[PDB]
């Protein structure tokens, strides 16, 4: 319930932008907690940070609604 | 441990507080300012050694007053130290403080001063039994109805703690028409830390 639209920080935007007409980069080091996904963020490759490790994951177009917090499982049950 | 601070039992009935305020919406500011007020007589207590400070309050004025048994060092040579203490207190306050000095009579029948004195003999390596006994006799020489005394800790610069004290006269503790006093004070020569407690009774 975030009735006034999505929420993505502006200190997430500042790594690269010129990968819009070219083949994208591989390094996206971040914190990857607060920001959700809205369709301008499709098909990148982000090192999602889980408190210890910026774990790399790339994007499908239907991995689209939830935040960057599904893909930082901080439990380590193995 | 089970017992009660006895002045916290009789307050409201046969005595009052030491802050006669009635303040809304500026209460905790004056509380933690009065907390600073009480600390500042550490300059006094090494020499002046007052017992109680009653703090009443007008609209925009500060009207305090003290009780003591030693009127010498508190009045200065000609009141010049008195105005200096007013200035140094106002530097922490910023408000019109108007201090006062009231002298107590029969001064040996206090609570805090006698315990402070026997803690002073403890801080000069003087034996605890003789000091307690001469203290309760010289308090009985003042004219009373009873004195209870108790000291604890590592007594007389020794090992694992004992706790022992002596009493004479009557002391109705469990009764409310009492008008008794009470005081606790720490002690240390160099070993650990000790504590003295002291009681009087003089009827209602």
């Amino acid at each position: 319930s975030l009735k006034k639209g999505p929420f993505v920080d502006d200190h997430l935007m500042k790594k690269v932008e010129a990968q819009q007409g070219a083949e994208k980069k591989k390094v996206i080091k971040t914190w990857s907690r607060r920001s959700t996904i809205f369709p301008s963020f499709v098909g990148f490759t982000i090192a999602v940070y889980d408190g210890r490790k910026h774990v790399p994951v790339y994007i499908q177009e239907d991995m689209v609604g939830h935040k960057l917090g599904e893909f930082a499982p901080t439990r380590t049950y193995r | 441990g089970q017992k009660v601070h006895p002045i916290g039992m009789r307050v409201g009935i046969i005595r009052d507080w030491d802050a006669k305020w009635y303040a809304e919406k500026e209460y905790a500011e004056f509380l933690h300012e009065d907390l600073r007020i009480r600390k500042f007589i550490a300059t006094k207590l090494a020499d002046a050694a007052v017992s109680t400070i009653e703090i009443e309050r007008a609209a925009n004025r500060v009207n305090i007053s003290i009780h003591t048994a030693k009127p010498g060092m508190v009045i200065g040579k000609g009141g010049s130290e008195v105005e200096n203490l007013r200035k140094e207190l106002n530097k922490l306050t910023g408000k019109r403080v108007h201090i006062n000095i009231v002298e107590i009579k029969k001064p040996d029948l206090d609570a805090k001063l006698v315990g402070e004195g026997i803690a002073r003999q403890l801080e000069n390596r003087v034996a605890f039994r003789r000091a307690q006994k001469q203290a309760i006799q010289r308090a009985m020489r003042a004219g009373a109805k009873g004195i209870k005394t108790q000291v604890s800790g590592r007594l007389n610069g020794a090992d694992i703690a004992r706790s022992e004290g002596y009493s004479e006269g009557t002391v109705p503790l469990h009764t409310l028409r009492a008008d008794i006093d009470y005081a606790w004070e720490e002690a240390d020569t160099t070993y650990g830390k000790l504590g003295v407690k002291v009681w009087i009774y003089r009827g209602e």
Binding site: - | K20, E56, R57
Partner: protein, 99 residues
């Protein structure tokens, strides 16, 4: 008429002694003062557990008590206003005047 005051303190003895003093000075230059109307005397409680580390099964509480009195004045003189501004003490009660 154009004056009614309030009394709020902690001790009813200080309340009604200062109230009897101001009733004594009330119809000095004026007339027709109304008496000490009582008020329901709000009260609070607290709760402090009797330990430092454990032992919530034994507790302790205190109370705030605020006694309130009320004195109304009907058809006053102008001379009592400057008289009551010469009346300032005791300090344990705080007055609450209107016009």
């Amino acid at each position: 008429q154009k004056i009614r005051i309030r009394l709020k303190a902690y001790e009813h003895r200080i309340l009604d002694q200062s109230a009897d003093k101001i009733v004594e000075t009330a119809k000095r230059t004026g007339a027709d003062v109304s008496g000490p109307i009582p008020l329901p005397t709000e009260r609070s409680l607290y709760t402090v557990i009797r330990a430092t580390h454990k032992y919530k099964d034994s507790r302790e509480q205190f109370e705030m008590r605020t006694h309130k009195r009320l004195i109304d004045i009907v058809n006053p003189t102008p001379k009592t206003v400057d008289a009551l501004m010469k009346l300032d003490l005791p300090s344990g009660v705080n007055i609450e005047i209107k016009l």
